Description:
Helix content of chain A is about 90%, strand content about 0%. Chain A is mainly alpha-helical. Chain A is rod-shaped, with a radius of gyration of 12 Å.
Amino acid sequence: RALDFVQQFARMKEQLDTAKDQLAEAQ
Amino acid sequence: RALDFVQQFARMKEQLDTAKDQLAEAQ
């Protein structure tokens, strides 16, 4: 309900960070 | 508790933009 969503949102934040680092490596 | 969904949609917006920029760099 709440804790599960917090974990999910931190997960997608780390997803975003991984995507940004991949992008930086690409450039 | 719609703040959760709004923040989630913002996260997906940022992820989508990152993926689009990755596509542009590959091109």
